[PDB]
Scaffold this motif. Structure first.
Motif, PDB file in Angstrom:
ATOM      1  N   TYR B  42      24.143  42.856  24.656  1.00 17.16           N
ATOM      2  CA  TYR B  42      22.782  43.027  24.172  1.00 17.16           C
ATOM      3  C   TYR B  42      22.230  44.363  24.646  1.00 17.16           C
ATOM      4  N   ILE B 164      23.458  44.825  28.670  1.00 17.26           N
ATOM      5  CA  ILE B 164      23.445  43.714  29.615  1.00 17.26           C
ATOM      6  C   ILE B 164      24.655  42.840  29.320  1.00 17.26           C
ATOM      7  N   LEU B 166      26.350  39.602  29.256  1.00 14.76           N
ATOM      8  CA  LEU B 166      25.939  38.207  29.290  1.00 14.76           C
ATOM      9  C   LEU B 166      27.070  37.332  29.815  1.00 14.76           C
ATOM     10  N   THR B 167      26.718  36.388  30.684  1.00  6.09           N
ATOM     11  CA  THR B 167      27.622  35.318  31.100  1.00  6.09           C
ATOM     12  C   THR B 167      27.426  34.135  30.161  1.00  6.09           C
ATOM     13  N   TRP B 168      28.329  33.984  29.196  1.00  7.01           N
ATOM     14  CA  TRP B 168      28.180  32.937  28.193  1.00  7.01           C
ATOM     15  C   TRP B 168      28.460  31.578  28.820  1.00  7.01           C
ATOM     16  N   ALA B 169      27.499  30.667  28.703  1.00  7.06           N
ATOM     17  CA  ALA B 169      27.548  29.356  29.330  1.00  7.06           C
ATOM     18  C   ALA B 169      27.230  28.298  28.281  1.00  7.06           C
TER      19      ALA B 169
ATOM     20  N   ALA E  88      22.756  33.115  28.853  1.00  5.10           N
ATOM     21  CA  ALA E  88      23.365  32.889  27.548  1.00  5.10           C
ATOM     22  C   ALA E  88      23.855  31.447  27.484  1.00  5.10           C
ATOM     23  N   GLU E  89      23.145  30.615  26.724  1.00  3.32           N
ATOM     24  CA  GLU E  89      23.445  29.192  26.619  1.00  3.32           C
ATOM     25  C   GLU E  89      23.574  28.828  25.148  1.00  3.32           C
TER      26      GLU E  89
END
Ligand SMILES: [Zn+2]
Lengths: 150, 183, 765, 43, 104, 146, 227, 34
Positions: B42, B164, B166-169, E88-89
């Motif tokens: 992003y 940025i 992102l840590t995708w969860a 990010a979910e």
RNA sequence: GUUGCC
């Protein structure tokens, strides 16, 4: 300022698209005349109404004669107006013909006409293009400076 | 006759919706799965969403065409520009309850081909160094001259800005009860 | 006096012409110019600046025409009839207020003279507005004058209502030996006139433009607009299960010929072959000049970042180019009335006011710095004393712009000549017939008799029995009796309003189903993609009948293509009709009896919901009804009055529904050359050549047209006795014989008046 | 705004060879309107 | 004529969405998006005579019109962001899309 | 003229039946154009045949069409009985918009009295729809001279 | 037949509008062979005789395949073998292929291959639509033949085309009585004296059906002032 | 020819493969098929 | 020289 009398040559009209050059001006005793003495002012030949199909002039006159005899102006509009069948009745209540076609005598010779004449008032407006500012003549006049023609 | 009451419980959260322009829903009336996101990307002030996807291996891969031309492998990335609109509320139902939240932006994901863009930026750089063929003082704003602005200025600020990582969860229950407790 | 709505709907037709007259298009544009349209121009050219001595600025706060702000008197003015015989221009000065830096401090100054605008008669900035023949008797001007005409330096003139092809939209073109194109001319309101073309050379879709150095094919210019997946290209233009895939698939492999394949590489293919207009800075990026080359193109739409709404606007334009190659029935004509835009007086002289006004405040700027390039002349200098030298450039520009009918524009570089004429004071209705006429453009289609002909989509829009012949036989047309021209309103509220009525945005829907669904076109651009329109469009009318939206909107909804249209651009033709909701109309004669009592005019009928205007497009969806004795339970829009198809100069024909159809046009050319009367002050005026007539008569059989314009009150011609017969051989074809006596009694004595003039000149010595 | 030349006036819409040399302008003419008359003979 | 073919499909559109809001009661992390009209001049989804749908989100303002209408071969996923951080979910995918239309 | 309608309307309904007579000359759905054109140019003629024979002498259009002075058996037949059908370069007034001629008439309704034919006489009068269709062939009578 | 009929005979213009040619038959009946010459003279396009054209690969083959409707030849009653189609593909100069690679596979199946950057896909894709528009039999010039009947039982053969030399040489039509239009091809084929007599018979033709009559002699003077 | 390539939707291309074999594969996406 | 009209 100048005024003039409408002598022959000038362009008269009929408000339905019948142009006319004034052919000849004749004296008063030569035209026909009805039972009451009315001299017709302007005479058209009947050689226009079959070709030009100008039936509106033929319906102008039947509503034309009936209005001034009844003393009221009449409404001839577009897509309607004063109808024909109630307009013939006011003509025949006075003594005139039911189709406006009155009879006449001949002003030249004195007796009747073998046929009848369609009769009455039509609205004639004068038009432009009178003749005295179109009469032109050049005997031996100016020449152009470059090529010496007239 | 009946009534199903709804209330809106959403603030402070700008949740977004992606649109897969590649992947259909159903394969013979049966819906498939959504793929596994390796990572995201992003940039603020231009709102791009650069989603990475990985591919299948040698069976449908043809690696010796991939290694010999660009050397960027196992990555399909795709770009989506986030756009803004009014309305467009997202809702989940409870038993005889339904709760809503406003969606802030919507992006439409098109396949951004990263490597073939990157294949020619090296091709031009080597062309300069084969035959290289060869100083800034201030200027004055003049009222009879124009300056670049508008839409291409947005591309001047969408090229260099802070990424940025992102840590995708996968959560989805923490936000769920957060709406339930709020009236 | 038992009234009904059966035959007494006619008595509201004069209520429409009482408050809204016969010169509607000429005055209501100039009245829109002087009040509102001048403030929107000083706000677009304010703050002239000098780069030398940078603390000097002249900015304009407002602009007014007419009265001052100090005295607050009405006006001090020469009357127009006192002006029209002295070869002067009827003018009132323009006043502005300005503030600037004199020196030690800034001061503001009020009511500065800059020029003298001419004012057309019966516009509200003249004396003759709202007079009751008592002030007008002092000013010796006729009450029955139509008005709406300039009298610039003597002879009186008027500009015509000119029209052109509909800008900022699209058409289609079909040609056999050349291939087929479709035009899309657009005009941003500053310095641009750009038109785009899409050509099919030997079976491939192409694209050219008058700013690109050569042709650029179609798959590039859509991948540069973002749509890159190359299945979406076919998905937009073709759809599914058709023959369009077989025609269009040739174009897709030229992407493979040039090896582009992505949105990054698509742009610089254009800018490699863009024609470079030098901006003399030229820091060209090889990425930034292509985004603007995909911005200064098809100037209907402009973009911020996403390019997306501009992208599929091209895709809808290239759908109709493959619909035409399937069968040539999909062609449109460029003389259909829906592709015509009448545009009126005051919003057409506004363009000429630009090229003079920007020429004012730049030579005035060039006079400033010529003074300010002095060392001693810097402290107590005032700049206002050299404004009078540049003042009359506005005046002498405007006066020759009306005198010699040719306009030298610069921001378009366009040379429309013959834009004005000298009005005919030969008859009365000749002074009103020329006030309502339309001049076309003459784009050199002299071989094509298409626009020479008359199309059926004209019933009541503009007159059908009036057209001159000879040099122009179908290119001079005349407005109908009941006729109003639209004007622009706005466009951003209705775009917010249609979202409320249940439509979505384009940036959410995929093209898999927009061809399945319909689509709204706001000024030709897809914005909503609605389905089930008959619930949607009927809810839109019911807001308009109650008057929440402006009433000059059309909801044309065709079905040959899967689209619906919206129009709000203004400058198009329309007439009103009365609403018929079901098998009973909304006539409601108890409303019509309250009109003849006089408390509610025609304007209240469109407030309640009994009448609305219909343009040429909205006629195509509607099913309008002639008479109340012909109502069908599926039948709307009853005719307000059926004889309203003839203009104010053809209306004097009695019973025109009986005669032959060409023998009405031959009278419209000659009614306007009839000797009669001119005005009540006709023995006072000193004009070039007038014919006057001694003993006129009102005609015997009248018409409902001629009592609207008071033709009977000063008519032309007598009504003599006619006995149709042949006589003496002198009447063979259409000659006519009249006596020596009745002309001696005064039958048609005409009278000719002529001007001559000299000027006593003062020489050098 | 284009200058008239030699070649711009021998040819064209009555420059020469139709307006001055083929069909000329002449002296001793006149022009009035026509009205019928039966009473005079033909010729 | 062709005005009658509109109402019967909107009649059948009530039943196709009343089934869908019934199967979705099991809250299996399912989502649907729909657009509310802004610009007010909360409520309750109701069932009228023989299956007719309306909401009253105003104190008096009634909105009769609702309709499940868009056909789309795309996988749309609702996901949250927060303050440019590790937020990010993926929550779930979206089954359908209806609209809300104020009647006039 | 009603039996001319009564033979017309039976012919116009066989589009759902889909009959095509297929004249030699490659019709492709214009027999229904050319047969009505032959049908309406018939009814104009025998109506003109009634006006000539069933008429007294001393009719002034009759006596100058017996001679070759001015007029014809067509020009007198359009003043008393029926004006006929207007022709535009060999065509029966094609559509203006949406496969119809004027906003008075129903959609895709390919009947005469709607496209080209006008049934009443000049002595009777003209209706606001049929006045314009005569006012079209009155135009190209002036155009071709230019 | 009007003002745009007089204009091009006086101009003798090259590209005339609608040059119809009139050729009479041999016999009078129909005989199931009166319309058999219409097949031998019209532009018999192969897309009418083909039905299903498709590309097929096995593992290493790049050949397009076409099939014909054998049950249609007898319907419109043309007569031709199978080999002359395989002649006609290499009788097309627009497609740049090798002269003879054509190999027949049975009675109704026929294939032609292509083999040589990236030629192979493009040369089988340009080939796909440029095949179903080649002439196989008949004239390469004319468009559409039409048979009609006059007030006698005799039938003629209209052709709306340009060439005349190859119309006369074919069977089934007699070359003695073949009139035409478009004067300035008669000068190429039938000498010069025929071209003079043609412009006589054409001018008084298009004056015969306008009502007035000029003269036979006022065109006989015009007939040889041009020739 | 409805030659959609999955995960890019772009096109397919008949590629001259190894030993002249006719494998089909598009550019700008690592995908192949016999 | 340029436009308007019959
Ligand atoms: Zn691929």
């Amino acid at each position: 300022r100048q005024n003039r009398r409408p002598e022959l040559g000038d362009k008269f009209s009929s408000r339905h698209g019948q142009k006319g050059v004034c052919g000849i001006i004749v004296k008063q005793e030569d035209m026909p005349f009805n039972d009451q003495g009315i001299v017709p002012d302007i005479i058209m030949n009947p050689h226009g109404f079959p070709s030009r199909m100008t039936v509106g002039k033929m319906i102008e006159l039947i509503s034309g004669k009936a209005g001034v005899l009844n003393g009221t102006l009449e409404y001839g509009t577009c897509f309607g107006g004063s109808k024909l069948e109630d307009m013939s009745k006011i003509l025949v209540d006075q003594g005139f013909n039911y189709s406006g076609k009155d009879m006449l005598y001949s002003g030249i010779t004195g007796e009747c006409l073998q046929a009848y004449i369609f009769f009455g008032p039509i609205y004639y407006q004068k038009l432009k293009h009178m003749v005295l500012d179109k009469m032109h003549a050049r005997a031996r006049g100016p020449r152009a400076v470059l090529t010496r023609q007239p | 006759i009946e009534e199903f009451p709804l209330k809106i419980s959403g603030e402070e959260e700008s949740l977004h919706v992606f649109q897969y322009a590649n992947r259909p829903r159903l394969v013979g009336r049966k819906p498939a799965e959504h793929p596994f996101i390796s990572a995201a990307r992003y940039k603020p002030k231009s709102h791009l969403w650069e989603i990475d996807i990985p591919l299948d291996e040698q069976a449908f891969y043809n690696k010796d065409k991939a290694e010999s031309e660009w050397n960027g492998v196992n990555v399909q990335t795709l770009k989506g520009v986030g756009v803004e609109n009014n309305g467009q509320y997202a809702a989940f139902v409870k038993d005889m309850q339904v709760y809503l939240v406003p969606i802030e932006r919507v992006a439409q994901l098109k396949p951004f081909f990263k490597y073939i863009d990157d294949a020619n930026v090296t091709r031009k750089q080597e062309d300069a160094r084969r035959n290289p063929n060869p100083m800034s003082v201030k200027s004055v704003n003049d009222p009879s001259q124009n300056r670049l602005t508008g839409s291409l200025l947005a591309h001047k600020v969408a090229d260099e800005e802070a990424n940025i990582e992102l840590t995708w969860a996968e959560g989805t229950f923490e936000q769920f009860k957060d709406t339930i407790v709020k009236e | 006096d038992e009234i009904n709505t059966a035959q007494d709907k006619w008595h509201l037709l004069p209520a429409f012409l009482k408050v809204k007259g016969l010169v509607k298009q000429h005055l209501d544009s100039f009245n829109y110019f002087v009040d509102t349209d001048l403030k929107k121009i000083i706000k677009a050219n304010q703050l002239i600046l000098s780069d030398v001595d940078p603390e000097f600025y002249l900015k304009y706060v407002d602009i007014r025409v007419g009265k001052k702000s100090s005295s607050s008197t009405k006006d001090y003015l020469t009357p127009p009839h006192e002006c029209r015989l002295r070869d002067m221009t009827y003018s009132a000065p323009i006043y502005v207020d300005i503030e600037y830096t004199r020196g030690r401090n800034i001061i503001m100054h009020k009511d500065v003279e800059i020029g003298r605008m001419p004012i057309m008669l019966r516009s509200n900035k003249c004396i003759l507005y709202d007079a009751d023949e008592s002030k007008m008797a002092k000013l010796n001007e006729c009450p029955l004058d139509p008005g709406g005409y300039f009298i610039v330096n003597g002879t009186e003139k008027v500009i015509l209502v000119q029209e052109q092809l509909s800008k900022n939209r699209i058409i289609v073109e079909a040609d056999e030996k050349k291939g087929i194109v479709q035009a899309s001319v657009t005009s941003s309101t500053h310095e641009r006139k750009s038109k785009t073309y899409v050509i099919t050379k030997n079976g491939k879709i192409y694209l050219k433009h008058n700013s690109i150095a050569e042709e650029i094919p179609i798959a590039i210019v859509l991948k540069a607009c973002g749509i890159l997946s190359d299945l979406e290209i076919m998905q937009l233009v073709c759809g599914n299960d058709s023959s369009y895939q077989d025609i269009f698939a040739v174009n897709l492999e030229e992407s493979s010929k040039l090896d582009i394949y992505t949105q990054q590489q698509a742009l610089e293919y254009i800018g490699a072959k863009v024609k470079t207009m030098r901006r003399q800075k030229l820091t060209i990026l090889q990425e930034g000049i292509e985004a603007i080359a995909t911005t200064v193109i098809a100037h209907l739409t402009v973009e911020a970042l996403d390019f997306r709404e501009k992208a599929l606007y091209i895709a809808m334009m290239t759908r109709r180019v493959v619909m035409a190659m399937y069968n040539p029935k999909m062609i449109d004509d460029r003389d259909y009335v829906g592709n015509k835009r009448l545009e009126l007086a005051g919003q057409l002289i506004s363009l000429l006011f630009e090229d003079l006004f920007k020429k004012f405040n730049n030579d005035f700027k060039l006079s400033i710095d010529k003074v300010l390039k002095k060392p001693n002349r810097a402290m107590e200098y005032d700049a206002l004393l050299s404004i009078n030298v540049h003042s009359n450039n506005i005046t002498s520009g405007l006066n020759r712009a009306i005198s010699t009918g040719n306009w030298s524009l610069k921001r378009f570089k366009m040379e429309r000549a013959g834009v004005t004429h000298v009005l005919s004071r030969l008859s009365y209705i000749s002074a009103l017939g020329m006030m309502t006429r339309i001049s076309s453009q003459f784009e050199k289609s002299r071989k094509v008799s298409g626009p020479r002909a008359l199309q059926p989509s004209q019933f009541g829009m503009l007159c059908t029995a009036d057209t001159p012949e000879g040099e122009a036989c179908g290119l001079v047309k005349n407005l109908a009796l009941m006729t109003h021209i639209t004007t622009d309103d706005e466009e951003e509220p209705i775009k917010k309003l249609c979202y409320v009525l249940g439509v979505e945005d384009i940036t959410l829907i995929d093209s898999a189903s927009l061809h399945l669904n319909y689509g709204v076109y706001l000024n030709g651009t897809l914005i909503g993609s609605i389905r089930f329109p008959t619930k949607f469009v009927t809810q839109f009318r019911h807001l308009r009948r109650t008057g929440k939206v402006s009433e000059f909107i059309s909801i044309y909804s065709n079905s040959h293509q899967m689209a619906v249209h919206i129009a709000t651009d203004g400058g198009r033709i329309c007439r009103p009709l009365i609403i018929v909701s079901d098998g009973q109309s909304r006539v409601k004669d108890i409303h019509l009896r309250k009109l003849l009592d006089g408390e509610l005019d025609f304007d209240d009928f469109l407030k309640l919901g009994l009448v609305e205007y219909l343009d040429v497009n909205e006629e195509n969806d509607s099913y309008i009804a002639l008479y109340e004795k012909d109502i069908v339970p599926s039948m709307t829009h009853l005719e307000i009055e059926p004889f309203t198809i003839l203009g104010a100069v053809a209306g004097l024909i009695p019973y025109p529904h009986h005669n032959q159809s060409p023998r009405n046009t031959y009278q419209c050319a000659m009614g306007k050359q009839a000797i009669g009367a001119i005005a009540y002050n006709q023995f006072k005026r000193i004009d070039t050549l007038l014919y006057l007539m001694t003993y006129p008569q009102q005609p015997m059989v009248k018409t409902k047209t001629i009592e609207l314009i008071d033709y009977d009150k000063l008519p032309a011609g007598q009504n003599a006795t006619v006995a149709v017969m042949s006589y003496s051989g002198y009447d063979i074809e259409d000659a006519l014989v009249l006596n020596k006596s009745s002309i001696d009694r005064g039958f048609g004595r005409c009278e000719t008046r002529r001007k001559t003039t000299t000027v006593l000149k003062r020489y050098a010595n | 705004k284009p200058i008239r030349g030699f070649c711009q006036r021998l040819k064209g819409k009555q420059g020469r060879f139709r307006g001055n040399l083929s069909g000329k302008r002449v002296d001793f003419s006149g022009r009035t309107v026509i009205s019928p008359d039966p009473n005079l003979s033909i010729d | 004529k062709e005005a009658a073919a509109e109402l019967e499909l909107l009649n059948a559109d009530h039943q196709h969405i009343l089934r869908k809001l019934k199967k979705m009661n099991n809250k299996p992390e399912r989502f649907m998006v729909f657009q509310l009209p802004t610009r007010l001049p909360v409520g309750s989804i109701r069932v009228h005579k023989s299956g007719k749908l309306s909401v009253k989100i105003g104190n008096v303002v009634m909105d009769i019109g609702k309709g499940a209408e868009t056909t789309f071969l795309q996988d749309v996923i609702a996901l949250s962001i927060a303050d440019d951080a590790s937020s990010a979910e993926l929550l779930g995918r979206v089954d359908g899309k209806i609209v809300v239309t104020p009647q006039i | 003229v009603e039996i001319a309608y009564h033979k017309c309307d039976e012919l116009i309904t066989l589009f759902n039946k889909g009959e095509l007579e297929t004249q030699p000359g490659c019709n492709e759905e214009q027999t229904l154009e050319a047969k009505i054109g032959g049908l309406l140019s018939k009814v104009r003629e025998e109506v003109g045949d009634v006006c000539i024979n069933e008429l007294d002498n001393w009719n002034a259009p009759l006596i100058m069409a017996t001679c070759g002075s001015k007029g014809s058996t067509l020009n007198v037949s359009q003043m008393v009985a029926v004006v006929g059908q207007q022709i535009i370069s060999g065509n029966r007034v094609p559509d203006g918009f949406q496969d119809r001629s004027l906003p008075h008439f129903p959609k895709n309704s390919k009947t005469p009295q709607s496209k080209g034919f006008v049934r009443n006489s000049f002595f009777s009068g003209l209706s606001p729809p049929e006045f314009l269709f005569h006012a079209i062939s009155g135009r190209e009578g002036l155009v071709d001279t230019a | 037949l009007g003002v745009p009929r007089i204009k091009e005979i006086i101009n003798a213009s090259k590209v005339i509008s609608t040059p119809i040619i009139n050729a009479v038959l041999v016999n009078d009946n129909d005989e199931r062979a009166a319309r058999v010459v219409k097949g031998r003279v019209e532009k018999t396009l192969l897309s009418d005789v083909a039905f299903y054209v498709q590309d097929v690969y096995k593992d290493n083959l790049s050949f397009i395949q076409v099939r014909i409707d054998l049950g249609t030849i007898d319907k419109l009653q043309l007569e031709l073998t199978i080999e002359d189609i395989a002649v006609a593909i290499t009788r097309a100069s627009k497609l740049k292929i090798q002269a003879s690679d054509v190999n027949i596979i049975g009675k109704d199946r026929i294939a032609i291959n292509v083999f040589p950057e990236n030629d192979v896909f493009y040369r089988m894709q340009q080939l796909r639509r440029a095949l179903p528009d080649v002439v196989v039999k008949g004239l390469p010039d004319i468009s559409r033949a039409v048979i009609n009947i006059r007030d006698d039982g005799k039938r003629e053969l209209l052709v709306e085309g340009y060439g005349l030399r190859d119309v006369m040489c074919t069977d089934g039509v007699i070359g003695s009585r073949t009139t035409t239009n478009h004067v300035l091809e008669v000068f190429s084929v039938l000498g010069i004296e025929a071209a003079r007599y043609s412009i006589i018979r054409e001018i008084n033709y298009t004056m015969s059906n306008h009502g007035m009559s000029v003269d036979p002699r006022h065109i006989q003077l015009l007939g040889d002032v041009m020739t | 020819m409805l030659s959609f390539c999955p995960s890019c939707n772009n096109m397919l291309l008949i590629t001259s493969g190894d030993s002249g074999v006719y494998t089909l594969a598009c550019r700008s996406c690592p995908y192949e098929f016999p």
